[PDB]
């Protein structure tokens, strides 16, 4: 058991174990993922706002933040020290640096504390060796609990929701932009949805050959092979769904097309267990996708982590040996893309529990014509 | 004239000749709001991936970019130096600085530059005198030229259209977040629309009352009075509106507070000229507030400006003694707060253009029943 939303405490004590067995001291954290990750909360619009929280080797954190974001901090379980703006906070952080930690000593920086705040702050970073967080702090986000893991899967089933209620209505004289947002408006009429994991991408016709599109003025017709992905957040956590369609029946050559990357992403989806290299489930996509003639066209990874951000380890790539373990959480989302032609993507969020690989999102896989 | 769909090479003179004078000899951005300034566009998602512009005391801009972020850069009127993830960017921006920069001399950072970058060209930057960007370009961005505040107008123009349509509908029964997300919408769907400037917000009856209210389930319900308050971007610039109504004929105190703040908002926006200080601005909505005996009740600034961000200089505070010039562009926003009961404010954008003080938002002011 555990007082806050979830385990943060846990999360604490694991972390300090673990940067204090890599020789570090302690850990500063700026309002952002890692602050979450911590807390469970997250305070915006900080720009050049000193807000950070101070993880010593022992005990619990300290919060030095803005008078003006009191309420935020009402019931966080440790110090508080509130600074109005008719006071200097750099001097406040520099007492409580130089009674916590030693000098000369390994410190933890978060990577996202913006260097205008380092600066003013330079004083006392002088003072320490100053290390980058995402390598020790990384290793414990890649692994989930099972309440992460139930943020997931509650994030995916409210993707799934939006996606039968979406291909309900008429897309055929409608533009990507306007998709997108009907597809972003739906995600938010969705009981227990946050917000948007990030804003909704939607590829028709050839503009489908660019992984990378952003939704244009183009118009949706029959004939458009129409490439939706979309994600929410619940609880600060997020999923990520792709799904492809057909206006009118599909040209032969799509259908091809897209029964290769169906059997290549469920196939991919199976080889997912604990023990095996990120790149053998990535080679398991690929390999198929080359075995049909259309390799040279996958072009990107099989899968990305997700977290509490939308990219994240472990990463399904050709290079990876990192081996799977339980408790990460990932996208298996091959695709065959043609140049001027069409695009086809399919696109799961996938969780590893008890040793074998899980479907988070489990919307119509198969080829749906319009 | 100027080739770009704004005057960014008179900006990057300017901003060379301004921090020049102040003893600087060049300035390193990193993606964000200075970025859009100086180039009109802002790459996303570089999260420790160094992408910065380098800008000298003579000449143009510099790119040092990831190799992925090609076509975003295909048209820069300056040097792209792209690097691939088989490379060590840090070597291929040492190299530069050093060919560049005398050494020892002052240089201007971007606020926004993540520490992790930082960190990885701490030998580099070990080697300057670093300064913060924000006092020396926000001298220059709190002047509008005529394209930004077109960009301002148009963006207001979206979110007048918005309001009319958006009262239309009915609101009784449905929630805050259920409304908010129907204005976002409904911004989106406005040609021009970039994206909104911020998440709309609707604050309900007692809710009315916190200024800083985000959003809840709450219902709406005849009785209350309800504020919205949301934004849109045009090019990048944005706009900030607020309005306040009600369900049912108002109940006589209502109708009171109201009309203060009616008379409050547009008396400031007359005051609003070339040469006067932000304060007298300040005090005029507030002196009028106070006059009826609410001064302990309208518990913030007056307004503050708007540019790439939704909240810049100038700041129409108590304390500033800022003297107003043609092309600030700023909100006059005064309100009036009620804990437990509710809240009344009105948002208009304003522009001081020719030495008086334009409305770039126009939505009418009075008290709306529904």
Not at 46 to 67: H, K
Not at 103 to 126: H, Q, W
Not at 238 to 248: A, F
Request: contains cysteine; glycine residues 8%.
């Amino acid at each position: 058991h555990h007082h806050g939303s979830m385990d943060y405490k846990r999360r604490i004590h694991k972390f300090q174990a673990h940067f204090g067995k890599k020789g570090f001291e302690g850990a500063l954290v700026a309002p952002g993922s890692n602050f979450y990750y911590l807390t469970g909360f997250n305070p915006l619009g900080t720009l050049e706002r000193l807000f950070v929280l101070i993880l010593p080797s022992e005990g619990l954190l300290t919060a030095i933040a803005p008078r003006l974001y009191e309420k935020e901090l009402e019931e966080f379980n440790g110090e508080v020290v509130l600074w109005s703006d008719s006071e200097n906070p750099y001097k406040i952080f520099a007492t409580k640096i130089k009674e916590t930690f030693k000098e000369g000593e390994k410190l933890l920086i978060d990577d996202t504390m913006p260097v205008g705040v380092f600066l003013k702050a330079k004083d006392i970073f002088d003072k320490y060796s100053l290390h980058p967080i995402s390598p020790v702090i990384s290793e414990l986000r890649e692994i989930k609990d099972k309440d992460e893991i139930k943020a997931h899967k509650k994030a995916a089933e409210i993707v799934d929701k939006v996606f039968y209620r979406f291909i309900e209505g008429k897309l055929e004289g409608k533009s990507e932009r306007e998709l997108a947002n009907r597809i972003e408006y739906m995600i938010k009429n969705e009981f227990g949805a946050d917000d948007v994991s990030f804003e909704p991408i939607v590829a028709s016709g050839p503009n489908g050959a660019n992984p990378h599109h952003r939704p244009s003025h183009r118009k949706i017709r029959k004939g458009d092979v129409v490439i939706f992905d979309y994600g929410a957040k619940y609880l600060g956590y997020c999923s990520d769904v792709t799904r492809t369609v057909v206006v009118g029946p599909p040209s032969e050559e799509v259908k091809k097309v897209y029964e290769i990357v169906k059997e290549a992403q469920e196939t991919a989806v199976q080889k997912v267990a604990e023990g095996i290299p990120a790149e053998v489930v990535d080679a398991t996509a690929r390999g198929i996708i080359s075995k049909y003639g259309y390799g040279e066209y996958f072009i990107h990874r099989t899968g990305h982590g997700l977290g509490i951000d939308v990219h994240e380890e472990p990463y399904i790539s050709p290079g990876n040996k990192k081996i799977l373990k339980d408790g990460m959480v990932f996208t298996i989302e091959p695709g065959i893309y043609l140049q001027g032609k069409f695009g086809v993507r399919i696109e799961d969020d996938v969780a590893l529990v008890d040793k074998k690989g899980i479907r988070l999102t489990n919307a119509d896989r198969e080829l749906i014509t319009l």
